[PDB]
Amino acid sequence: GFEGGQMPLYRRLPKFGFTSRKAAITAEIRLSDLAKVEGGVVDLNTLKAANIIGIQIEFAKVILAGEVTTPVTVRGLRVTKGARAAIEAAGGKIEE
Amino acid sequence: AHKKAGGSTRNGRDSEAKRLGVKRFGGESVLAGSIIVRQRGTKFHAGANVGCGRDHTLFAKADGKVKFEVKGPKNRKFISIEAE
Amino acid sequence: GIREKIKLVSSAGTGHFYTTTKNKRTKPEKLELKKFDPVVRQHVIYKEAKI
Amino acid sequence: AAPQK
Amino acid sequence: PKIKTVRGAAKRFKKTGKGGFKHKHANLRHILTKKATKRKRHLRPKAMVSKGDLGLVIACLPYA
RNA sequence: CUUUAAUGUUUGAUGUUCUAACGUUGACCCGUAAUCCGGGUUGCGGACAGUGUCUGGUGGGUAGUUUGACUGGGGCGGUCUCCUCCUAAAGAGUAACGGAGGAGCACGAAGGUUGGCUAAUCCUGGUCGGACAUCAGGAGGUUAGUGCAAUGGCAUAAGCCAGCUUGACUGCGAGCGUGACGGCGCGAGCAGGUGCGAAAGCAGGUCAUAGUGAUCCGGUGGUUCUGAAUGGAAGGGCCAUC
RNA sequence: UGAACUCGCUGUGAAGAUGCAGUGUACCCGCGGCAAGACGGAAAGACCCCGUGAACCUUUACUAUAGCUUGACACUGAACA
RNA sequence: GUUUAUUAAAAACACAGCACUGUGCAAACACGAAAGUGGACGUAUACGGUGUGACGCCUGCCCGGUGCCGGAAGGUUAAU
RNA sequence: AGGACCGAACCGACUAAUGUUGAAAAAUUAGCGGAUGACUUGUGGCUGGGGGUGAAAGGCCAAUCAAACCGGGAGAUAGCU
RNA sequence: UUUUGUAUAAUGGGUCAGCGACUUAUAUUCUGUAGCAAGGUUAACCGAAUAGGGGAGCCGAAGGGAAACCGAGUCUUAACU
Ligand SMILES: COC(=O)c1c(OC)cc2cc3c(c(O)c2c1C)C(=O)[C@]1(OC)C(=O)C=C(OC)[C@@H](O)[C@]1(O)C3=O
Ligand SMILES: [K+]
Ligand SMILES: [K+]
Ligand SMILES: [K+]
Ligand SMILES: [K+]
Ligand SMILES: [K+]
Ligand SMILES: [K+]
Ligand SMILES: [K+]
Ligand SMILES: [K+]
Ligand SMILES: [K+]
Ligand SMILES: [K+]
Ligand SMILES: [K+]
Ligand SMILES: [K+]
Ligand SMILES: [K+]
Ligand SMILES: [K+]
Ligand SMILES: [K+]
Ligand SMILES: [K+]
Ligand SMILES: [K+]
Ligand SMILES: [K+]
Ligand SMILES: [K+]
Ligand SMILES: [Mg+2]
Ligand SMILES: [Mg+2]
Ligand SMILES: [Mg+2]
Ligand SMILES: [Mg+2]
Ligand SMILES: [Mg+2]
Ligand SMILES: [Mg+2]
Ligand SMILES: [Mg+2]
Ligand SMILES: [Mg+2]
Ligand SMILES: [Mg+2]
Ligand SMILES: [Mg+2]
Ligand SMILES: [Mg+2]
Ligand SMILES: [Mg+2]
Ligand SMILES: [Mg+2]
Ligand SMILES: [Mg+2]
Ligand SMILES: [Mg+2]
Ligand SMILES: [Mg+2]
Ligand SMILES: [Mg+2]
Ligand SMILES: [Mg+2]
Ligand SMILES: [Mg+2]
Ligand SMILES: [Mg+2]
Ligand SMILES: [Mg+2]
Ligand SMILES: [Mg+2]
Ligand SMILES: [Mg+2]
Ligand SMILES: [Mg+2]
Ligand SMILES: [Mg+2]
Ligand SMILES: [Mg+2]
Ligand SMILES: [Mg+2]
Ligand SMILES: [Mg+2]
Ligand SMILES: [Mg+2]
Ligand SMILES: [Mg+2]
Ligand SMILES: [Mg+2]
Ligand SMILES: [Mg+2]
Ligand SMILES: [Mg+2]
Ligand SMILES: [Mg+2]
Ligand SMILES: [Mg+2]
Ligand SMILES: [Mg+2]
Ligand SMILES: [Mg+2]
Ligand SMILES: [Mg+2]
Ligand SMILES: [Mg+2]
Ligand SMILES: [Mg+2]
Ligand SMILES: [Mg+2]
Ligand SMILES: [Mg+2]
Ligand SMILES: [Mg+2]
Ligand SMILES: [Mg+2]
Ligand SMILES: [Mg+2]
Ligand SMILES: [Mg+2]
Numbered sequence: 108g109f110e111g112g113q114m115p116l117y118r119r120l121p122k123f124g125f126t127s128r129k130a131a132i133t134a135e136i137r138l139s140d141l142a143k144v145e146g147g148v149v150d151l152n153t154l155k156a157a158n159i160i161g162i163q164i165e166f167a168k169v170i171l172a173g174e175v176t177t178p179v180t181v182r183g184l185r186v187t188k189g190a191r192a193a194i195e196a197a198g199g200k201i202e203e
Numbered sequence: 204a205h206k207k208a209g210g211s212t213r214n215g216r217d218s219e220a221k222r223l224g225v226k227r228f229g230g231e232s233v234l235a236g237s238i239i240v241r242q243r244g245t246k247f248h249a250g251a252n253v254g255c256g257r258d259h260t261l262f263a264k265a266d267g268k269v270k271f272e273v274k275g276p277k278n279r280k281f282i283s284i285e286a287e
Numbered sequence: 288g289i290r291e292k293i294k295l296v297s298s299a300g301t302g303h304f305y306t307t308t309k310n311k312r313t314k315p316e317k318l319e320l321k322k323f324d325p326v327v328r329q330h331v332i333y334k335e336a337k338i
Numbered sequence: 339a340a341p342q343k
Numbered sequence: 344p345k346i347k348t349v350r351g352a353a354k355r356f357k358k359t360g361k362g363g364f365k366h367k368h369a370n371l372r373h374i375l376t377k378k379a380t381k382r383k384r385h386l387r388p389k390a391m392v393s394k395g396d397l398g399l400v401i402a403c404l405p406y407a
Numbered sequence: 408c409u410u411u412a413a414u415g416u417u418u419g420a421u422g423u424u425c426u427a428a429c430g431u432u433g434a435c436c437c438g439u440a441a442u443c444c445g446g447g448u449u450g451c452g453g454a455c456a457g458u459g460u461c462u463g464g465u466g467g468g469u470a471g472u473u474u475g476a477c478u479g480g481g482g483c484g485g486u487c488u489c490c491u492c493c494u495a496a497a498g499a500g501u502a503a504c505g506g507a508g509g510a511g512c513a514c515g516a517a518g519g520u521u522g523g524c525u526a527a528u529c530c531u532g533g534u535c536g537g538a539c540a541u542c543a544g545g546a547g548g549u550u551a552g553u554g555c556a557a558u559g560g561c562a563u564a565a566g567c568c569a570g571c572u573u574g575a576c577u578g579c580g581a582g583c584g585u586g587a588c589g590g591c592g593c594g595a596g597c598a599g600g601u602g603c604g605a606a607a608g609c610a611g612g613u614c615a616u617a618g619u620g621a622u623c624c625g626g627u628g629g630u631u632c633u634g635a636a637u638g639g640a641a642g643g644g645c646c647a648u649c
Numbered sequence: 650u651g652a653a654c655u656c657g658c659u660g661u662g663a664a665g666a667u668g669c670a671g672u673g674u675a676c677c678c679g680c681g682g683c684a685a686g687a688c689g690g691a692a693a694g695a696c697c698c699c700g701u702g703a704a705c706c707u708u709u710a711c712u713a714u715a716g717c718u719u720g721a722c723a724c725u726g727a728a729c730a
Numbered sequence: 731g732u733u734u735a736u737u738a739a740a741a742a743c744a745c746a747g748c749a750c751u752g753u754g755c756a757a758a759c760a761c762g763a764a765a766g767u768g769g770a771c772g773u774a775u776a777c778g779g780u781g782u783g784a785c786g787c788c789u790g791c792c793c794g795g796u797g798c799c800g801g802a803a804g805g806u807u808a809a810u
Numbered sequence: 811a812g813g814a815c816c817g818a819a820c821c822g823a824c825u826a827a828u829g830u831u832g833a834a835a836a837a838u839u840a841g842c843g844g845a846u847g848a849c850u851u852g853u854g855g856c857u858g859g860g861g862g863u864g865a866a867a868g869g870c871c872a873a874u875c876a877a878a879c880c881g882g883g884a885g886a887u888a889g890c891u
Numbered sequence: 892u893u894u895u896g897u898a899u900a901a902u903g904g905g906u907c908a909g910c911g912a913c914u915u916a917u918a919u920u921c922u923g924u925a926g927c928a929a930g931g932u933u934a935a936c937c938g939a940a941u942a943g944g945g946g947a948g949c950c951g952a953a954g955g956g957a958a959a960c961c962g963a964g965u966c967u968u969a970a971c972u
Contacts, residue, residue, distance in 0.1 A: 108349060117349065117352040117355055117399075118622055119590095120622075121372060121621090123644085125632095125645095125958070128633085137953090161948095171963070187962055188961095188962085189964095211486085212505075213507095214505070214506060216509090217490090218492095219489085221585090222586095228498090235582060235583095236595065241585095241592095242559080244558090244559045244615065245559095245560060245561080245565095256592095256593050257594095257615080259559095260584085262583075288513080308376065314515080319515095320575095322573075322577095323601075324600095325577045328599065329600070330573095339695090344918065359955095372622080375648060376649090384579080387646090393589090405919050405920080
C-alpha cells in the first residue's frame with residue numbers, strides 16, 4: 108500500500124459501519140440440507156448432530172436453495188417465504 | 204571577477220485547462236443526455252431537441268444526429284438534433 | 288469574513304434543520320423562511336438559531 | 339597528507 | 344507465518360459477490376454547509392473500487 | 408431579603424510555652440588493646456529539621472531528535488493551492504526562475520417568477536449652475552452595463568425598474584464530459600410538497616469560468632440499528648452539522 | 650602490471666591519440682644520462698554537491714530529565730492565646 | 731615558566747597584583763542512589779567561583795532589554 | 811641573597827641541510843634554550859570512558875581519541891557503488 | 892561496467908588453480924498437471940507406524956445491508972419507471 112508518499116488509498120477513505128456480534132452465531136440452511144439429518148425432524152440440535160452447522164450456532168434460517176423432495180418437519184427454525192412453499196409442496200410442515 | 208546574482212520573475216502562474224470545445228460533430232449519432240458542446244457563454248445556441256445547462260453546456264434531449272446550422276438575422280450558430 | 292454560519296430550525300416538533308451563512312452585523316434581525324421539512328413532509332416555517 | 343586542490 | 348491483514352483497510356473496504364470491493368465516498372465528513380445538496384446527495388451511496396486500485400486493495404486484504 | 412450582634416459548634420490559620428517522637432559532626436562511662444559503630448547517662452535543639460508519596464516553578468547541567476523542495480552548481484533572493492489570456496503549431500492536451508493580471512469572497516436580495524424598459528458620448532436651449540449635477544430636443548447605435556481580474560457571452564437581453572415570494576426544496580436519476588486515482592462537472596425525466604403566471608410554462612441559487620483542504624480524532628442534535636447472563640444504560644453505528 | 654610487433658605531424662573522435670584517417674620518417678639490440686608525455690605511481694577527492702547518512706558542539710528550536718526550589722499528607726505530640 | 735608526543739613555542743596559557751561575588755562551620759562547593767570523603771585536623775587576615783593580568787596615570791555616561799538581589803499589596807495559579 | 815649571570819652532565823626542541831620503498835612508523839649533523847628551581851630523575855601507589863587528567867593545544871589516557879580497547883546485541887541499517 | 896554517448900586519456904583485473912552471489916520455512920494468489928466432484932480434504936493424536944483410524948476444523952454450493960433483518964433477492968425511499 109505504499110504509493111511514494113501520497114496518502115494511500117486505504118487512508119484517504121473513511122471508515123464505516125460496525126461489526127455485529129449476533130451475526131457470528133447465525134447460520135443459513137439449504138433445502139438440500141434438510142434431507143441429510145437423521146429422523147426427519149429438523150431443529151438446531153438435529154442440524155448440529157449432522158455437522159450441518161457449528162456448535163456455537165443459535166439461530167438458523169432455511170432458504171430457497173436447492174430442492175427438497177422428502178417430507179420434513181421444521182421445528183424452531185425460521186423459514187423464508189419461498190422455502191416455506193417448497194417444504195409445503197413436499198408435504199412437510201413448519202411449526203413454532 | 205565576481206559572479207553576479209540575477210533577479211526574479213514576477214510572473215509564473217496559470218490555471219488548469221478546462222477541456223472546452225465541441226464533443227460531438229455533425230452527423231454523429233448521440234443518446235439523450237449526451238453533451239455536445241462545452242462553452243463559455245453561448246458561442247453556440249440550443250436548437251431543436253437541444254438543451255442548455257446552467258454553464259451553457261449544450262446537451263441532447265433526444266436521440267438522433269447532430270446538425271449544425273446558421274439561423275436568424277444575427278447569423279448565429281445553432282445546434283439541433285434530427286431524429287433517425 | 289463577517290458572513291457567519293447559522294442554522295434554521297424547523298418550527299414543527301421535528302429536529303430537522305438547515306444551515307446557512309448570515310452577515311451578522313448588517314442584518315441583525317432573525318432570518319425566517321418557509322422550507323420543506325422531510326420528516327412531516329410539509330412546507331413549514333423555519334427560524335434562525337445558533338450553529 | 340598533502341596540499342589539496 | 345500467516346499473512347497479517349492491514350487492519351486499517353479491513354475497516355474501509357468490504358468484498359462483494361463477484362469479488363469487487365465497495366467503499367464509502369470521501370468529502371462527506373465536515374465543511375458541509377458550503378457543499379451543494381446535489382453534490383452531498385451523490386456522495387451518500389457506497390461505491391466500487393476502480394480498476395487501477397484493485398491491485399493495491401487485494402494486497403492489503405489477503406484473507407477477504 | 409439587607410445591614411448586623413451574641414451564643415453554640417465545626418474546620419482552617421498565626422503566635423507563645425512544654426517534652427515524650429526525632430536530631431546531635433556537645434561532654435562523660437562501657438563493649439575495648441578502637442577519633443568506626445552500638446548501648447548508657449547528661450546538655451542543647453524540638454515537633455521544627457530531615458526523609459518518602461504527590462504537586463507548581465526553574466532547569467543546554469544532561470539526553471533523544473528535527474531544522475523542506477525547486478534551482479542553467481549550492482547559498483542568498485523568489486516560488487509552492489486556485490482562476491483568465493498569450494506562448495500552444497485553426498479538435499483536446501502541451502514546458503521554462505517565459506510574457507501579463509486576479510482569488511482565499513459578497514448577496515434573504517444582488518435568488519425565483521410575472522409585467523415593463525433600453526446605453527456611452529457629444530451638440531443645441533434653459534434660475535443659481537461652473538469643462539462636468541437636474542430639465543427638453545437632436546445626433547449616435549452598445550463605443551455602455553455585468554457585485555470584484557481576464558476571456559467568451561448577452562437586445563428574446565444575461566443590462567435597468569416594480570409587484571408577489573423562498574425552488575438558495577426533500578428522495579432519486581436515463582445519459583454524458585474530465586481525471587492514474589481520490590475525485591470534479593452537466594443533465595432530461597420520475598415521487599412528494601411549494602412560489603410566480605390567465606395560461607403555455609419557469610424555479611433543485613447568482614451571465615459562465617476563482618472565493619478552497621482528504622483521512623484520523625473529538626463535539627452537538629436526531630434515530631424503527633447494536634446493547635458481552637437477563638432488563639436498562641454507557642459506548643458504537645446510521646442521518647444532519649461543527 | 651588487460652595484452653603489446655610500444656615513432657612524428659595534421660585532422661577526426663566521449664570534445665588534449667603510440668594504436669583511427671592521410672602523410673612523413675625509421676636496419677636489429679644494449680649501456681650511461683635528462684625528465685616533455687604515457688591525462689605516469691601512491692590514496693574508492695580531504696574542495697563542491699547529494700543522502701528524508703553519522704558525530705560532536707550551541708541556543709530564549711521541540712520533548713524530557715538529574716539537580717535546586719514550593720506546598721499537601723505520613724513519621725508527628727501536649728497546653729494556651 | 732607552560733603548550734598542540736608526531737608540520738604551529740607564539741602576541742596563546744600561567745603569573746604576582748586587582749575587583750566582584752558566595753560561604754558562620756554538620757560552611758559554600760565537589761565525588762557518591764547512600765554511608766562517607768575532600769575543602770580542613772582549616773574558621774572571614776579563611777575557603778570556593780568569575781573576570782582582569784607587574785608597575786605608573788586612570789577606569790567616564792546608560793538599569794530601557796536579559797540576568798541577579800530585595801519586596802509584598804493586588805491579579806492569576808498545583809496537588810488537596 | 812637570587813623562579814640572578816656564563817657554561818658541562820641532565821632536561822628541552824628554535825633554524826638549516828640530509829633522510830622520506832629511511833640507520834629510524836619522528837632520527838642524524840651543525841648551530842640553539844634552561845641549567846638551585848613553577849627544576850630533573852629512580853621505585854611504588856591513586857584517578858577509567860560522557861569518565862579521568864589538563865599552566866587549556868579538543869591536548870593526553872599503551873604507535874588508536876570531538877568520546878580508548880575487547881567481546882556481545884549483530885548478518886544494525888545502507889532509496890548508495 | 893556505467894552511460895545520451897567510451898579505442899577512450901572514465902572504472903576493474905599481474906597470471907594460474909581452488910572457493911565465491913536469487914536460498915530455506917510458513918501463509919496467500921495465479922498457471923500447468925493428477926484425484927475426487929456439489930462436494931473436496933483432514934490437523935494434533937492413536938497406530939507391531941509412509942497403511943488404517945481420527946472430519947475437531949477449513950474452503951465451496953447465496954446474496955443484499957452499518958446493523959436489526961430479509962433472502963434469489965435485497966438496500967436506498969413515504970414510494971419507486
Ligand atoms: C589547504 O590545506 C591543505 O591543502 C592541507 C595541507 O597543506 C599543506 C596540509 C595538511 C596536513 C594535514 C591535514 C590536512 O587536511 C592538510 C591540508 C588540508 C589533515 O587533515 C591531517 O591529515 C593527516 C589530519 O588528519 C588531522 C590534522 O589536523 C586536525 C592534520 O594535522 C593532518 O595530520 C595533516 O598533516
Ligand atoms: K539526646
Ligand atoms: K534549469
Ligand atoms: K551553468
Ligand atoms: K492554445
Ligand atoms: K425581483
Ligand atoms: K617523464
Ligand atoms: K620559545
Ligand atoms: K597555550
Ligand atoms: K592587555
Ligand atoms: K540596562
Ligand atoms: K535590569
Ligand atoms: K528596574
Ligand atoms: K620523586
Ligand atoms: K565513550
Ligand atoms: K568494470
Ligand atoms: K560518467
Ligand atoms: K579517474
Ligand atoms: K565513477
Ligand atoms: K506458490
Ligand atoms: Mg506530504
Ligand atoms: Mg577564471
Ligand atoms: Mg486556461
Ligand atoms: Mg458525520
Ligand atoms: Mg543537545
Ligand atoms: Mg530545553
Ligand atoms: Mg534513534
Ligand atoms: Mg536542493
Ligand atoms: Mg488547441
Ligand atoms: Mg493543432
Ligand atoms: Mg422579463
Ligand atoms: Mg465583455
Ligand atoms: Mg459572476
Ligand atoms: Mg446486557
Ligand atoms: Mg590498433
Ligand atoms: Mg577505420
Ligand atoms: Mg596513420
Ligand atoms: Mg636508457
Ligand atoms: Mg632525475
Ligand atoms: Mg596519476
Ligand atoms: Mg569517491
Ligand atoms: Mg530525499
Ligand atoms: Mg622564556
Ligand atoms: Mg607539533
Ligand atoms: Mg616546532
Ligand atoms: Mg587577558
Ligand atoms: Mg567601565
Ligand atoms: Mg524575586
Ligand atoms: Mg637562573
Ligand atoms: Mg614538550
Ligand atoms: Mg643537537
Ligand atoms: Mg647547552
Ligand atoms: Mg637566560
Ligand atoms: Mg646557562
Ligand atoms: Mg611512576
Ligand atoms: Mg580550536
Ligand atoms: Mg597515543
Ligand atoms: Mg558517542
Ligand atoms: Mg538486532
Ligand atoms: Mg553488514
Ligand atoms: Mg557523462
Ligand atoms: Mg567508437
Ligand atoms: Mg581504460
Ligand atoms: Mg593508452
Ligand atoms: Mg568496476
Ligand atoms: Mg588497475
